[PDB]
Design an enzyme around this catalytic site. Structure first.
Site, PDB file in Angstrom:
ATOM      1  N   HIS G 201      -9.158  24.069 -11.808  1.00  0.00           N
ATOM      2  CA  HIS G 201      -9.277  25.483 -11.488  1.00  0.00           C
ATOM      3  C   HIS G 201      -7.934  26.183 -11.338  1.00  0.00           C
ATOM      4  N   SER G 205     -10.312  26.198 -18.079  1.00  0.00           N
ATOM      5  CA  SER G 205     -10.706  25.293 -19.146  1.00  0.00           C
ATOM      6  C   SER G 205     -10.074  25.707 -20.469  1.00  0.00           C
ATOM      7  N   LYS G 227     -26.554  28.151 -18.321  1.00  0.00           N
ATOM      8  CA  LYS G 227     -26.151  27.265 -19.401  1.00  0.00           C
ATOM      9  C   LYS G 227     -26.034  25.823 -18.930  1.00  0.00           C
ATOM     10  N   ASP G 228     -25.656  25.610 -17.670  1.00  0.00           N
ATOM     11  CA  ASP G 228     -25.661  24.263 -17.111  1.00  0.00           C
ATOM     12  C   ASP G 228     -27.068  23.795 -16.757  1.00  0.00           C
ATOM     13  N   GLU G 271     -23.817  -5.431 -18.463  1.00  0.00           N
ATOM     14  CA  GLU G 271     -24.435  -4.189 -18.883  1.00  0.00           C
ATOM     15  C   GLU G 271     -23.699  -3.631 -20.096  1.00  0.00           C
TER      16      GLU G 271
HETATM   17  C1  HEM Z   1     -17.419  11.662 -11.956  1.00  0.00           C
HETATM   18  C2  HEM Z   1     -16.720  12.025 -13.031  1.00  0.00           C
HETATM   19  C3  HEM Z   1     -16.319  13.464 -13.458  1.00  0.00           C
HETATM   20  C4  HEM Z   1     -16.693  14.689 -13.041  1.00  0.00           C
HETATM   21  C5  HEM Z   1     -17.716  15.101 -11.962  1.00  0.00           C
HETATM   22  C6  HEM Z   1     -15.961  15.665 -13.816  1.00  0.00           C
HETATM   23  C7  HEM Z   1     -16.055  17.032 -13.705  1.00  0.00           C
HETATM   24  C8  HEM Z   1     -15.468  17.938 -14.557  1.00  0.00           C
HETATM   25  C9  HEM Z   1     -15.830  19.327 -14.691  1.00  0.00           C
HETATM   26  C10 HEM Z   1     -16.941  20.056 -13.913  1.00  0.00           C
HETATM   27  C11 HEM Z   1     -15.050  19.872 -15.617  1.00  0.00           C
HETATM   28  C12 HEM Z   1     -15.131  21.349 -16.053  1.00  0.00           C
HETATM   29  C13 HEM Z   1     -16.016  21.613 -17.274  1.00  0.00           C
HETATM   30  C14 HEM Z   1     -16.146  20.492 -18.273  1.00  0.00           C
HETATM   31  O1  HEM Z   1     -15.211  20.260 -19.077  1.00  0.00           O
HETATM   32  O2  HEM Z   1     -17.218  19.848 -18.301  1.00  0.00           O
HETATM   33  C15 HEM Z   1     -14.139  18.853 -16.100  1.00  0.00           C
HETATM   34  C16 HEM Z   1     -13.157  19.004 -17.049  1.00  0.00           C
HETATM   35  C17 HEM Z   1     -12.323  18.011 -17.506  1.00  0.00           C
HETATM   36  N1  HEM Z   1     -12.475  16.666 -17.265  1.00  0.00           N
HETATM   37 FE1  HEM Z   1     -13.919  15.829 -16.109  1.00  0.00          FE
HETATM   38  N2  HEM Z   1     -15.135  14.995 -14.684  1.00  0.00           N
HETATM   39  C18 HEM Z   1     -15.331  13.652 -14.487  1.00  0.00           C
HETATM   40  C19 HEM Z   1     -14.689  12.649 -15.167  1.00  0.00           C
HETATM   41  C20 HEM Z   1     -13.645  12.816 -16.041  1.00  0.00           C
HETATM   42  C21 HEM Z   1     -12.973  11.757 -16.745  1.00  0.00           C
HETATM   43  C22 HEM Z   1     -13.410  10.292 -16.569  1.00  0.00           C
HETATM   44  C23 HEM Z   1     -12.019  12.311 -17.520  1.00  0.00           C
HETATM   45  C24 HEM Z   1     -10.960  11.716 -18.485  1.00  0.00           C
HETATM   46  C25 HEM Z   1     -10.553  10.446 -18.525  1.00  0.00           C
HETATM   47  C26 HEM Z   1     -12.072  13.733 -17.296  1.00  0.00           C
HETATM   48  C27 HEM Z   1     -11.248  14.651 -17.891  1.00  0.00           C
HETATM   49  C28 HEM Z   1     -11.447  16.004 -17.898  1.00  0.00           C
HETATM   50  C29 HEM Z   1     -10.620  16.975 -18.564  1.00  0.00           C
HETATM   51  C30 HEM Z   1      -9.357  16.654 -19.391  1.00  0.00           C
HETATM   52  C31 HEM Z   1     -11.145  18.176 -18.323  1.00  0.00           C
HETATM   53  C32 HEM Z   1     -10.625  19.529 -18.837  1.00  0.00           C
HETATM   54  C33 HEM Z   1     -11.265  19.753 -20.198  1.00  0.00           C
HETATM   55  C34 HEM Z   1     -11.270  21.203 -20.583  1.00  0.00           C
HETATM   56  O3  HEM Z   1     -11.402  22.072 -19.690  1.00  0.00           O
HETATM   57  O4  HEM Z   1     -11.137  21.482 -21.794  1.00  0.00           O
HETATM   58  N3  HEM Z   1     -13.073  14.013 -16.396  1.00  0.00           N
HETATM   59  N4  HEM Z   1     -14.430  17.682 -15.431  1.00  0.00           N
HETATM   60  C1  HEM Z   2     -23.521   6.194  -1.639  1.00  0.00           C
HETATM   61  C2  HEM Z   2     -23.857   5.722  -2.848  1.00  0.00           C
HETATM   62  C3  HEM Z   2     -24.609   4.419  -3.251  1.00  0.00           C
HETATM   63  C4  HEM Z   2     -25.300   3.536  -2.522  1.00  0.00           C
HETATM   64  C5  HEM Z   2     -25.590   3.549  -1.017  1.00  0.00           C
HETATM   65  C6  HEM Z   2     -25.798   2.502  -3.391  1.00  0.00           C
HETATM   66  C7  HEM Z   2     -26.569   1.441  -2.998  1.00  0.00           C
HETATM   67  C8  HEM Z   2     -27.090   0.488  -3.833  1.00  0.00           C
HETATM   68  C9  HEM Z   2     -27.912  -0.622  -3.429  1.00  0.00           C
HETATM   69  C10 HEM Z   2     -28.352  -0.910  -1.983  1.00  0.00           C
HETATM   70  C11 HEM Z   2     -28.210  -1.336  -4.511  1.00  0.00           C
HETATM   71  C12 HEM Z   2     -29.068  -2.622  -4.547  1.00  0.00           C
HETATM   72  C13 HEM Z   2     -30.536  -2.271  -4.728  1.00  0.00           C
HETATM   73  C14 HEM Z   2     -30.953  -2.598  -6.134  1.00  0.00           C
HETATM   74  O1  HEM Z   2     -30.389  -3.539  -6.728  1.00  0.00           O
HETATM   75  O2  HEM Z   2     -31.854  -1.911  -6.664  1.00  0.00           O
HETATM   76  C15 HEM Z   2     -27.579  -0.694  -5.647  1.00  0.00           C
HETATM   77  C16 HEM Z   2     -27.628  -1.102  -6.955  1.00  0.00           C
HETATM   78  C17 HEM Z   2     -26.841  -0.621  -7.976  1.00  0.00           C
HETATM   79  N1  HEM Z   2     -26.021   0.487  -7.922  1.00  0.00           N
HETATM   80 FE1  HEM Z   2     -25.876   1.773  -6.356  1.00  0.00          FE
HETATM   81  N2  HEM Z   2     -25.379   2.772  -4.670  1.00  0.00           N
HETATM   82  C18 HEM Z   2     -24.646   3.937  -4.617  1.00  0.00           C
HETATM   83  C19 HEM Z   2     -24.039   4.539  -5.692  1.00  0.00           C
HETATM   84  C20 HEM Z   2     -23.870   3.990  -6.940  1.00  0.00           C
HETATM   85  C21 HEM Z   2     -23.008   4.493  -7.973  1.00  0.00           C
HETATM   86  C22 HEM Z   2     -22.126   5.749  -7.883  1.00  0.00           C
HETATM   87  C23 HEM Z   2     -23.128   3.719  -9.044  1.00  0.00           C
HETATM   88  C24 HEM Z   2     -22.313   4.009 -10.330  1.00  0.00           C
HETATM   89  C25 HEM Z   2     -22.461   3.380 -11.494  1.00  0.00           C
HETATM   90  C26 HEM Z   2     -24.067   2.651  -8.720  1.00  0.00           C
HETATM   91  C27 HEM Z   2     -24.498   1.600  -9.501  1.00  0.00           C
HETATM   92  C28 HEM Z   2     -25.397   0.617  -9.145  1.00  0.00           C
HETATM   93  C29 HEM Z   2     -25.866  -0.455  -9.991  1.00  0.00           C
HETATM   94  C30 HEM Z   2     -25.459  -0.707 -11.455  1.00  0.00           C
HETATM   95  C31 HEM Z   2     -26.724  -1.193  -9.291  1.00  0.00           C
HETATM   96  C32 HEM Z   2     -27.488  -2.427  -9.803  1.00  0.00           C
HETATM   97  C33 HEM Z   2     -28.895  -1.954 -10.147  1.00  0.00           C
HETATM   98  C34 HEM Z   2     -29.736  -3.096 -10.629  1.00  0.00           C
HETATM   99  O3  HEM Z   2     -29.456  -3.654 -11.715  1.00  0.00           O
HETATM  100  O4  HEM Z   2     -30.700  -3.442  -9.922  1.00  0.00           O
HETATM  101  N3  HEM Z   2     -24.492   2.860  -7.425  1.00  0.00           N
HETATM  102  N4  HEM Z   2     -26.907   0.419  -5.195  1.00  0.00           N
HETATM  103  C1  LIG Z   3     -16.031  25.970 -15.970  1.00  0.00           C
HETATM  104  O1  LIG Z   3     -16.011  24.640 -15.440  1.00  0.00           O
HETATM  105  C2  LIG Z   3     -16.857  24.295 -14.447  1.00  0.00           C
HETATM  106  C3  LIG Z   3     -17.997  23.619 -14.668  1.00  0.00           C
HETATM  107  O2  LIG Z   3     -18.419  23.226 -15.880  1.00  0.00           O
HETATM  108  C4  LIG Z   3     -19.216  24.120 -16.657  1.00  0.00           C
HETATM  109  C5  LIG Z   3     -18.881  23.244 -13.539  1.00  0.00           C
HETATM  110  O3  LIG Z   3     -19.892  22.646 -13.792  1.00  0.00           O
HETATM  111  C6  LIG Z   3     -18.525  23.611 -12.145  1.00  0.00           C
HETATM  112  C7  LIG Z   3     -19.499  23.178 -11.082  1.00  0.00           C
HETATM  113  C8  LIG Z   3     -19.374  21.691 -10.882  1.00  0.00           C
HETATM  114  C9  LIG Z   3     -20.342  20.778 -10.748  1.00  0.00           C
HETATM  115  C10 LIG Z   3     -21.810  21.071 -10.752  1.00  0.00           C
HETATM  116  C11 LIG Z   3     -19.996  19.324 -10.571  1.00  0.00           C
HETATM  117  C12 LIG Z   3     -20.363  18.751  -9.196  1.00  0.00           C
HETATM  118  C13 LIG Z   3     -19.118  18.545  -8.402  1.00  0.00           C
HETATM  119  C14 LIG Z   3     -18.622  17.454  -7.817  1.00  0.00           C
HETATM  120  C15 LIG Z   3     -17.325  17.448  -7.061  1.00  0.00           C
HETATM  121  C16 LIG Z   3     -19.364  16.146  -7.898  1.00  0.00           C
HETATM  122  C17 LIG Z   3     -19.207  15.251  -6.657  1.00  0.00           C
HETATM  123  C18 LIG Z   3     -20.027  15.729  -5.499  1.00  0.00           C
HETATM  124  C19 LIG Z   3     -21.073  15.117  -4.948  1.00  0.00           C
HETATM  125  C20 LIG Z   3     -21.596  13.802  -5.436  1.00  0.00           C
HETATM  126  C21 LIG Z   3     -21.787  15.750  -3.780  1.00  0.00           C
HETATM  127  C22 LIG Z   3     -22.742  14.822  -3.010  1.00  0.00           C
HETATM  128  C23 LIG Z   3     -22.270  14.560  -1.614  1.00  0.00           C
HETATM  129  C24 LIG Z   3     -22.624  15.206  -0.500  1.00  0.00           C
HETATM  130  C25 LIG Z   3     -23.581  16.365  -0.474  1.00  0.00           C
HETATM  131  C26 LIG Z   3     -22.042  14.794   0.831  1.00  0.00           C
HETATM  132  C27 LIG Z   3     -22.985  13.943   1.700  1.00  0.00           C
HETATM  133  C28 LIG Z   3     -23.729  14.769   2.704  1.00  0.00           C
HETATM  134  C29 LIG Z   3     -25.050  14.857   2.892  1.00  0.00           C
HETATM  135  C30 LIG Z   3     -26.009  14.062   2.051  1.00  0.00           C
HETATM  136  C31 LIG Z   3     -25.713  15.717   3.926  1.00  0.00           C
HETATM  137  C32 LIG Z   3     -17.388  24.283 -11.919  1.00  0.00           C
HETATM  138  C33 LIG Z   3     -16.916  24.711 -10.571  1.00  0.00           C
HETATM  139  C34 LIG Z   3     -16.492  24.659 -13.050  1.00  0.00           C
HETATM  140  O4  LIG Z   3     -15.466  25.266 -12.836  1.00  0.00           O
END
Ligand code: HEM
Ligand code: HEM
Ligand SMILES: COC1=C(OC)C(=O)C(C/C=C(\C)CC/C=C(/C)CC/C=C(\C)CC/C=C(\C)CCC=C(C)C)=C(C)C1=O
Ligand SMILES: CCCCCCCCCCCCCCCCCC(=O)OC[C@H](COP(=O)([O-])OCC(O)COP(=O)([O-])OC[C@@H](COC(=O)CCCCCCCCCCCCCCCCC)OC(=O)CCCCCCCCCCCCCCCCC)OC(=O)CCCCCCCCCCCCCCCCC
Ligand SMILES: CCCCCCCCCCCCCCCCCC(=O)OC[C@H](COP(=O)([O-])OCC(O)COP(=O)([O-])OC[C@@H](COC(=O)CCCCCCCCCCCCCCCCC)OC(=O)CCCCCCCCCCCCCCCCC)OC(=O)CCCCCCCCCCCCCCCCC
Ligand SMILES: CCCCCCCCCCCCCCCCCC(=O)OC[C@H](COP(=O)(O)O)OC(=O)CCCCCCCCCCCCCCCCC
Ligand code: HEC
Ligand code: HEM
Ligand code: HEM
Ligand SMILES: COC1=C(OC)C(=O)C(C/C=C(\C)CC/C=C(/C)CC/C=C(\C)CC/C=C(\C)CCC=C(C)C)=C(C)C1=O
Ligand SMILES: COC1=C(OC)C(=O)C(C/C=C(\C)CC/C=C(/C)CC/C=C(\C)CC/C=C(\C)CCC=C(C)C)=C(C)C1=O
Ligand SMILES: COC1=C(OC)C(=O)C(C/C=C(\C)CC/C=C(\C)CC/C=C(\C)CC/C=C(/C)CCC=C(C)C)=C(C)C1=O
Lengths: 68, 70, 48, 59, 122, 243, 376, 376
Positions: G201, G205, G227-228, G271
């Protein structure tokens, strides 16, 4: 269709066996060529698998036609 | 917020003074053909490389399995 | 761009590179990392 | 061309506190219709295979 | 290397003309030029070269970029009468940018930096 | 190696394969009867309970009468001892052995595995199970089998420790279905496929409702997206630039 | 005016409602919102599953089964978690490939690319330790094979291996510490995502044209929310199909067998989303060299904003080489699922060499030639 | 400047290095940094603890014992995590009493006070459900007595109660879900703490004089780093004494007995930091009225920035009344550990009445009288 207390699967499998005469010939050729073996490692499992895969693919939908 | 020097006239119509999805049916075949015209070369070179290398690898693997037979 | 564009544009010159004295004093931090790791692990027979 | 009626606008659309309960009753009836259609299609297709068909057959 | 590098330059020129033909065909549908493809955020020398320009040139560049972005949103191209008039290789920036880069190369041989930085926001 | 992989099983026309199709619940009932009389002498199914068969396979009273014919260890009583009792709905299916080691000892060293998740625990599950049960064929040339082992080309390696257990007429079905070996194998394969995925019918009904709802919502969201973007997609920009 | 009185209203308004965004963004710019939604889905379903899972080697598989059959809506939650991991990796991989195609990591967005690579590494570790929790055959044996790569490091390899295991083998302390680390690492992912989004931000973008877009900007909340939503509904359709109709399609049947440390499976595979790294590792007949090659892949990913020249549609030679890179990574994905064989070893070696060639030779040099062609 | 080129360094510099702070802050302004240090310590010790704890009945007590006697440094980790909750509550209570003394929640810092009250509620819930986890007699019976207090809401009572328990009594589902909720809630605490600190930075802190301090501000990062370090070292001394010399002083001996649902202990009292609310609840001879009074205390806490007039010194009547309020709260803390007796019931009723009288009558009316005396 009438369901029989006897097993229809061996009869259906025997019926599909003329459809896979080439694989049977290959298996029998293998079985003849390893007849004089002495090391105990020569086997013909692959050509056997080819023949039974052909027969199984023929007989698979005709087996469940005769079963409830 | 980033002053941009520019000279223009801009016109905009209300979204309740035009249609929403009716032109989407007319433009759909043209957009399909335009998409494939624009991305034809990249998708083709991807497909050729991936499927050719996969097919060559699977063929030679089958030959390797046949070479182990007695 | 700043990494390889600067080498290709001719912006990286000997007069712009850091000096050999600067490279000596910056590279002296390598002994600090070695003695920090030896302090953390203490994997020696050095105390005798 | 096609345009929402004014008298129907003044009743169910001008205030959000009237729009939201209408939205909830429409949501209820839409869920009921979708449930009915899916269940009827599933029971018609799989007739004679369910457990209830065997139980009603044994009566 | 000098024996083969005498005639390696016409092959470079032929490849460059073919490249510019293809890309300028791609650019002309959006109404763009080759110099419009340079971003002041992406390069600080381009940002320096752009403030050395007269205001009407900058106004024209912004107008062309706005038209191209509007065309990109609408999934359209220019009409045929506008598309036949497009001049994708009419430079407005290459002389100023070449001077800026030559100045930066001159300052670097004497250990001096460029008298400008990147565009920093916030 | 091909022999280590074993022979692949053909794809049989199961009636529950399509996403619109339910289980054949009459075949689940006949498959459980094959389980009680042939399978359960050496296989445990330790994650099944009689409560889960109700409404799928039996009524409440039939399942209660089936569970009441089993002996379940319970305790401890007020004297600190272990006793036996009649099984109930909450009880799990009886295991033929107390532990893995006696199961291995009763079967030449091989442990007959649990069958609750054997359908989803094998590649090409139901087809492999049916072809393994009906596929005790003659070994090919150069393949010898040691004592205590039997040839089956669908088993990986080709030498299984489970003998031929399905015989013609070895189960007396209560619906008049004639019990050949293939019919018994098909019914027990159906029961095991239910055991791996007990909620497949409910999952498919929910999936049909979800797919219909999301498909309608995709059109409604596309409508609301195009309505918001319409003043931008149809805007008119006029400038002095010609180029 | 009302958002001018509270800080939290002002920050939300600035960064969600009135944030300027290029008007010509296409549907390739939806991967970020989808990745954030999939992270939120994974966190919710994981928090709900943690109320019924027991992290002990005597009760882990049994509690998974009990959650599947007896807990109301437990099958939906368990299948949603296990397949939402795969959809999370699909969306993130497509996001990264978008960035590779457009060269989005370039200046002034080096921080965005670097925080992205950090996010991807944390994601990989999170999924790997989550897969061990069901304590099946694949869950045990993959953790055994992968954590045994630490012995490739000389002198102190076995000591680090035994320190990570908590013993002489993968056993109960490994499962307990993996459960704690797995619960913990998604919150680090949420923090990293907040930092990653706030880094973007600063400048905004990039657009599909690859030009400066400051003359044509529109509000984010009014226009790109809908659009999202459209892309979120297309993702929800695929999610519904995978959960309800094909729940074990992207899984392995051996993970439904309980873990046995005295009998390994015939084909230990991960996987699908770790198969390209596994193919890179298996193609090289040296454990240290394979680990080094994986580290060099991720170093080349970190060094992309400083060695990479070449972007979108108007830079046509690198645009054509992008599809060769995509075919190479999908061939690496396919090769990981196959057994070791001389032709697969050769093809994997050639594919790894081409990946290194594209990352380190094509992106600087061909990018420089096309900059000289276009503006020289 | 180097911090002017990376946005992460700019925020860190602005809010931790160069932030202007009043120069006359005394040592009663170190409560917040100590509370943050205690939150970080609790998070670290717990994440380490969760690698050896099993959240199941018939394993929980034995896993805590195995942690205590067999895990290297496990006894230190457990005793630190147990006494750290007490020190966390000591520090947060002294912080709240500072804010009560100086009128720190007034305009324009009402959001700071409200976010603090929210943080306190989440802290209470976190500490309670974490106290259930060792599965002793005190854990089981306190969880039974508190969760079976939803039978005071008419009609919708035992429905909510049985949905909380996952059954008909406190059992394995209650413990299993309490583990997940307890792991999760401290990250919400950390996020709320970040928001709370960010809300204060909009206007900066008050000073002991209670006047405008914009003329005399100094940098935070040089002058208030060592000043926080001194108080942190005092807190570390108290913490080390509590861990190593009196590890079970603040606890209850009954929690070292495994939980028995059929036998109840003679006296069921919570931890010391919950005792004042327990005394308020136990003094009123009606369950619904006790829950209403407990809710009214926190409602009056939320309403304090909008009804509370009067600060520290130079407002001397409310300053004197603060000490009666402190004595009242400490008396309620003492009464909660006693038995139910008619004199203790009468004294607890009088203390609750005076607490409401001070919070709702003294703070507006006496404060208005002070303003009319000083500037009228
Ligand atoms: C949990 C993972 C991620 C989240 C939530 C996330 C979120 C975002 C969002 C919301 C944007 C703005 C709009 C868009 O381009 O879709 C963005 C842009 C971008 N992300 Fe991700 N991202 C993630 C992972 C990554 C990874 C793994 C990479 C690269 C290795 C990456 C690289 C970029 C770049 C370079 C931009 C700017 C692209 C542009 O605006 O043209 N992000 N990301
Ligand atoms: C606060 C967040 C999360 C919690 C508390 C959580 C918890 C758990 C637990 C308790 C299991 C075992 C139950 C089962 O095997 O079905 C599991 C399985 C798994 N989780 Fe999550 N998880 C979280 C987020 C994530 C995230 C971000 C990923 C990202 C890739 C992930 C990937 C997996 C995978 C691959 C398995 C194995 C599923 C299977 O083959 O059964 N988890 N998770
Ligand atoms: C032009 O570009 C842009 C986009 O692209 C078109 C976007 O999309 C967005 C909007 C971004 C989104 C929807 C992505 C979501 C953002 C994040 C940081 C993902 C991680 C956040 C999580 C997992 C929140 C969950 C955790 C919580 C609620 C805390 C725990 C508490 C409780 C459960 C009570 C923006 C701002 C943007 O500028
Ligand atoms: C089927 C065959 C499959 C293969 C071909 C794929 C589609 C063909 C056309 C491709 C294309 O260009 O798509 C866009 C294409 C037209 O695009 P365009 O107008 O040139 O530009 C707009 C943008 O491209 C699009 O941007 P937009 O945001 O403005 O439009 C959004 C919306 C456009 O909105 C719509 O009109 C779509 C409507 C959805 C139908 C749902 C109906 C259920 C509920 C109904 C409720 C509707 C309420 C409205 C009621 C009021 C009506 C008065 O489009 C969608 O999201 C729908 C899917 C579009 C393609 C996605 C798949 C691509 C990959 C192919 C995979 C297949 C293998 O739109 C459609 O496909 C919709 C029309 C249907 C085509 C059928 C054949 C017509 C002759
Ligand atoms: C998925 C997340 C994206 C949903 C975007 C929110 C939205 O505009 O509502 C569409 C949509 C509402 O359906 P709709 O009737 O077609 O939209 C209302 C009008 O078309 C137009 O309504 P509007 O222009 O008054 O919408 C402005 C929007 C405020 O929009 C924003 O400021 C968006 C901020 C977050 C953007 C999320 C992008 C990811 O506030 C709302 O009315 C909805 C607040 C809920 C957010 O959101 C939903 O409730 C669908 C489920 C999403 C959860
Ligand atoms: C022995 C074992 C037998 C196994 C038999 C089954 C093998 C797999 C199934 C058959 C696959 C072959 C046809 C695949 C068609 C897929 C679609 C496709 O390619 O379209 C993408 C693509 C579509 O482009 P788009 O529509 O623009 O996206 O089509 C093409 O561009 C054409 C691709 C042709 C290149 C691949 C040709 C086949 C490779 C075989 C190489 C054999 C080497 C032999 C060397 C040794 C000789 C001794
Ligand atoms: C004579 C005792 C016995 C009987 C009765 C028995 N099994 Fe087997 N079963 C075994 C043994 C031993 C194995 C394991 C053999 C091996 O792994 O080499 C086995 C294995 C299996 C397997 C898994 C094979 C594999 O590839 O892992 C299945 C499925 C199976 N049995 C199903 C059944 C069915 C269905 C029946 C009833 C028709 C049945 N069992 C009856 C002893 C028995
Ligand atoms: C984990 C819990 C908490 C943390 C980390 C925290 C942190 C802080 C910090 C770092 C400060 C600035 C330095 C200081 O004045 O101590 C502060 C100030 C303040 N806090 Fe807390 N706090 C917490 C709990 C609370 C609670 C429970 C309340 C009230 C119910 C509260 C109300 C306030 C107020 C009013 C101020 C401003 C004081 C003034 O400037 O006069 N905080 N907090
Ligand atoms: C991510 C953060 C945290 C984690 C993972 C965690 C973990 C745990 C675990 C596993 C236990 C049970 C083991 C044992 O009791 O020895 C426990 C108990 C406990 N937790 Fe924590 N905790 C965290 C934060 C907190 C916080 C912030 C508080 C207080 C506000 C707290 C208060 C307690 C208490 C009082 C106990 C009871 C300890 C006892 O009496 O033995 N925890 N916690
Ligand atoms: C079925 O099984 C299997 C997996 O699984 C699903 C796999 O993935 C893989 C292969 C995957 C590869 C090569 C890519 C992922 C690689 C690694 C090394 C994952 C990282 C995890 C490590 C090193 C475990 C150690 C855990 C730590 C350090 C916890 C994190 C905490 C902190 C840093 C504080 C294989 C072969 C496998 O057969
Ligand atoms: C001996 O007995 C006693 C205890 O025992 C040792 C106690 O502790 C307490 C102290 C407890 C008090 C005052 C009430 C605590 C506050 C609440 C709201 C009750 C806890 C609510 C629960 C567990 C409902 C379920 C919710 C959970 C787990 C988390 C909800 C999630 C989010 C907010 C995100 C008292 C008085 C007591 O006499
Ligand atoms: C009235 O004037 C003021 C004070 O009074 C003099 C203060 O005290 C403070 C605030 C003090 C702060 C922020 C320092 C205290 C520490 C806190 C809140 C956190 C404690 C953290 C520690 C010790 C280390 C944590 C370490 C790690 C690795 C966690 C981070 C995690 C990751 C990077 C993944 C402020 C703002 C102030 O204005």
């Amino acid at each position: 269709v009438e369901y029989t207390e006897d097993d229809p699967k061996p009869q259906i499998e025997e019926d599909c066996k003329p459809h896979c005469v080439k694989e049977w010939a290959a298996y029998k050729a293998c079985a003849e060529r390893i007849k004089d073996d002495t090391t105990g490692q020569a086997h013909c499992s692959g050509q056997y698998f080819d023949f039974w895969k052909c027969v199984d693919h023929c007989a698979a939908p005709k087996i469940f036609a005769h079963l409830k | 917020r980033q002053n941009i020097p520019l000279r223009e006239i801009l016109y905009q119509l209300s979204p309740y003074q035009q249609d929403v999805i009716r032109q989407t049916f007319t433009n759909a075949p043209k957009t399909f053909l335009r998409f494939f015209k624009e991305k034809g070369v990249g998708l083709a070179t991807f497909g050729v490389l991936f499927f050719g290398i996969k097919g060559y690898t699977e063929h030679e693997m089958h030959q390797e399995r046949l070479a182990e037979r007695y | 761009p700043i990494g390889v564009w600067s080498v290709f544009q001719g912006y990286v010159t000997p007069a712009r590179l850091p000096s050999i004295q600067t490279l000596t004093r910056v590279g002296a931090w390598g002994g600090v990392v070695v003695v920090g790791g030896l302090y953390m692990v203490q994997p020696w027979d050095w105390l005798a | 061309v096609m345009r929402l009626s004014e008298a129907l606008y003044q009743t169910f659309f001008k205030r959000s506190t009237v729009y939201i309960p209408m939205l909830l009753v429409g949501a209820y009836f839409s869920n009921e219709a979708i449930d009915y259609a899916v269940d009827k299609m599933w029971t018609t297709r799989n007739k004679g295979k369910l457990f209830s068909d065997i139980i009603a057959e044994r009566t | 290397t000098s024996l083969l590098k005498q005639v390696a330059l016409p092959v470079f020129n032929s490849l460059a003309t073919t490249y510019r033909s293809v890309v300028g065909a791609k650019l002309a549908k959006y109404g763009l030029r080759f110099d419009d493809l340079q971003d002041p955020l992406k390069d600080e020398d381009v940002a320096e070269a752009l403030r050395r320009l007269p205001p009407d040139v900058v106004v024209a560049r912004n107008c062309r970029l706005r038209r191209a972005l509007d065309l990109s949103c609408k999934h359209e191209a220019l009409p045929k009468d506008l598309l036949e008039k497009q001049t994708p290789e009419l430079s407005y920036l290459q002389d100023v940018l070449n001077e800026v880069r030559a100045e930066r190369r001159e300052r670097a041989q004497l250990g001096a930096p460029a008298p400008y930085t990147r565009i920093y926001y916030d | 190696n091909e022999a280590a992989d074993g022979l692949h099983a053909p794809h049989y026309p199961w009636g529950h394969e399509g996403v619109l199709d339910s289980y054949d619940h009459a075949a689940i009932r006949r498959g459980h009867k094959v389980y009680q009389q042939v399978c359960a002498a050496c296989h445990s199914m330790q994650y099944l309970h009689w409560r889960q068969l109700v409404g799928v396979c039996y009524t409440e009273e039939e399942a209660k009468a089936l569970a009441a014919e089993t002996e379940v260890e319970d305790g401890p009583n007020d004297e600190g001892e272990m006793f036996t009792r009649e099984g109930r709905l909450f009880d799990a299916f009886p295991s033929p052995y107390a532990n893995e080691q006696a199961a291995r000892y009763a079967n030449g060293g091989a442990y007959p595995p649990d069958l609750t998740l054997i359908s989803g625990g094998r590649h090409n599950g139901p087809n492999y199970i049916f072809s393994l049960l009906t596929g005790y064929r003659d070994p090919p040339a150069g393949i010898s089998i040691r004592e205590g082992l039997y040839y089956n080309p669908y088993f990986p390696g080709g030498a299984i420790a489970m003998p031929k257990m399905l015989v013609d007429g070895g189960v007396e079905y209560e619906d008049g279905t004639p019990a050949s070996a293939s019919q018994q194998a098909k019914d027990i394969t159906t029961f095991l496929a239910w055991a791996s995925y007990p909620y497949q019918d409910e999952m498919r009904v929910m999936g049909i409702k979800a797919c219909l709802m999301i498909s309608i919502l995709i059109g409604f969201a596309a409508y609301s997206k195009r309505l918001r973007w319409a003043p931008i997609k149809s805007q008119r920009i006029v400038m002095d630039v010609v180029n | 005016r009302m958002h001018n009185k509270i800080q939290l209203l002002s920050v939300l308004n600035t960064h969600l409602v009135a944030y300027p965004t290029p008007m010509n963004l296409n549907y390739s710019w939806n991967g970020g919102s989808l990745a954030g939604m999939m992270l939120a889905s994974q966190m919710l379903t994981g928090i709900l599953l943690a109320m019924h899972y027991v992290g002990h080697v005597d009760y882990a598989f049994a509690s998974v089964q009990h959650l599947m059959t007896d807990v109301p809506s437990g099958m939906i939650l368990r299948y949603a978690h296990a397949n939402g991991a795969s959809l999370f990796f699909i969306v993130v991989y497509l996001h990264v490939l978008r960035g590779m195609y457009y060269g989005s990591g370039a200046q002034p967005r080096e921080i965005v690319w670097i925080s992205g690579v950090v996010i991807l590494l944390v994601m990989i570790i999170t999924a790997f330790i989550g897969y061990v929790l069901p304590w099946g055959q694949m869950s045990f044996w993959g953790a055994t094979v992968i954590t045994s790569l630490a012995t490739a490091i000389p002198v102190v390899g076995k000591h680090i291996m035994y320190w990570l295991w908590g013993g002489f083998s993968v056993d109960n302390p490994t499962l307990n510490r993996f459960y704690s680390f797995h619960y913990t690492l998604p919150f680090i992912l949420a923090g990293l995502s907040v930092f990653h989004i706030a880094a973007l931000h600063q400048y905004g973008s990039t657009n599909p044209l690859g030009v400066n877009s400051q003359s044509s900007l529109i509000s984010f909340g009014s226009y790109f929310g809908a659009k999202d939503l459209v892309g979120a509904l297309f993702l929800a359709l695929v999610f519904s199909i995978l959960v309800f109709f094909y729940p074990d399609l992207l899984g392995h049947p051996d993970n439904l067998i309980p873990a046995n440390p005295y009998s390994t499976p015939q084909h230990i595979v991960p996987e699908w989303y770790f198969l390209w790294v596994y193919a890179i590792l298996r193609s090289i007949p040296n454990k240290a060299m394979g680990v080094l090659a994986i580290g060099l892949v991720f170093a080349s990913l970190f060094a992309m904003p400083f060695i990479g020249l070449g972007g979108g549609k108007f830079r046509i030679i690198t645009e054509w080489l992008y599809w060769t890179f995509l075919a190479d990574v999908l061939l690496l994905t396919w090769l990981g699922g196959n057994e070791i064989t001389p032709i697969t070893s050769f093809v994997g070696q050639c594919c790894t060499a081409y990946l290194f060639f594209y990352l380190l030779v094509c992106q600087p040099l061909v990018g420089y030639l096309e900059t000289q062609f276009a503006h020289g």
